[PDB]
Design a protein around this ligand. Structure first.
Ligand SMILES: [Zn+2]
Length: 39
């Protein structure tokens, strides 16, 4: 994106995978939102 400084080895943090990838997640793809429902 445009917020990856220093630790810019990975671009897209797949929260579903608890890790980021050098590209989109090979399963979940890009991450548009976090599935964290507040209650
Ligand atoms: Zn994933």
């Amino acid at each position: 994106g445009s917020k990856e400084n220093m630790a810019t080895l990975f671009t897209i943090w797949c929260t579903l995978c608890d890790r980021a990838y050098p590209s989109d997640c090979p399963e979940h793809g890009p991450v548009t939102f976090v599935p964290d429902t507040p209650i």
